[PDB]
Amino acid sequence: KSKLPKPVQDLIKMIFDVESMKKAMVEYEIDLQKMPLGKLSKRQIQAAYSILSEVQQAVDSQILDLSNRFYTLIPHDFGMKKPPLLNNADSVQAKAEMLDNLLDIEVAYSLLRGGSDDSSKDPIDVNYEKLKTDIKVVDRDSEEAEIIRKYVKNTHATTHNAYDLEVIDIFKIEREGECQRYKPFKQLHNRRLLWHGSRTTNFAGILSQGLRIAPPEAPVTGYMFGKGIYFADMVSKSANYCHTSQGDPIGLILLGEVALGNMYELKHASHISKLPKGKHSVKGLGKTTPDPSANISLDGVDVPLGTGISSGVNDTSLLYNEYIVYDIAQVNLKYLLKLKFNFKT
């Protein structure tokens, strides 16, 4: 059988779970009866993205046409009601986000159904290799893991208290080719260990391909700071994007080292087409920041595990900080946590 440790095997089963794929899709009111996971095509979705970008700028017959074209490519099922027309910046945003997750679900599933039936190897091992990622378990006991469990603890935001966070498994990760792609940006200053949360169904995509940035076409709504890779320094701001429910209270979250360099500090939304010369990222300024006094330097990389205090920031659209980079090579994925979401209710 597979020689990979039990917690690593569960992770691989958890990331390639066909049922979580169906269940997220069902949550998107997508109609699996007309389109089950197999019918999911990379083109079916890429073409579906195009339509959305027409609606985006076509903004009064013809819109019915675009929507009917959309809802035909991606058959939903409100059962009755007849699907909502795509006629506003809100309705198009939510649909691109859904589409964005359908891309990864297609990635996850297609990775799964590829490969030879040559079965010397245990299935779990075969699928582990498809991730192109080296994954090891960090000792609960070790100090490395004490910091991580401390970063989780002291950085829950006072206002998110709809749940509590427990660390089941800490994984140390190295995506193939990523050290080499990150290396130039190692020379950049102000490097930081930052959270990125995502739906579990996104992880076959994220491990095999890395955090990537939104393609040539997609709305800029919901992006306070444009198309990039977003991170937070408050664990709970990232955990919220895991989309864990009370019925599904266990999530996957990332800790990534990001080369922020000279940050372009913003208090309000500005899409900004280009970073100014000499700037290497954007930091949205929230009212509540991690206390600098606890900030810890680990191998030339800051860990802002300071508990949430206030900054003299006013007035700002942000409750908590936000960091965005616009080149995928500015990120080096370091840890992946399996989190436990204990809900209050």
Ligand SMILES: O=C1NC[C@H]2c3c(cccc31)CCN2C(=O)C1CCN(C(=O)c2cc(Cc3n[nH]c(=O)c4ccccc34)ccc2F)CC1
């Ligand atoms: O922890 C964070 N979760 C995400 C979130 C965020 C917030 C602030 C703090 C941290 C959180 C603010 C909102 N967040 C985001 O906006 C996301 C950041 C990263 N995102 C992407 O990198 C992204 C990924 C994809 C997947 C993808 N992209 N490009 C491809 O060619 C591709 C090809 C196959 C499969 C998937 C993709 C598409 C659009 C994207 F914007 C989505 C937007």
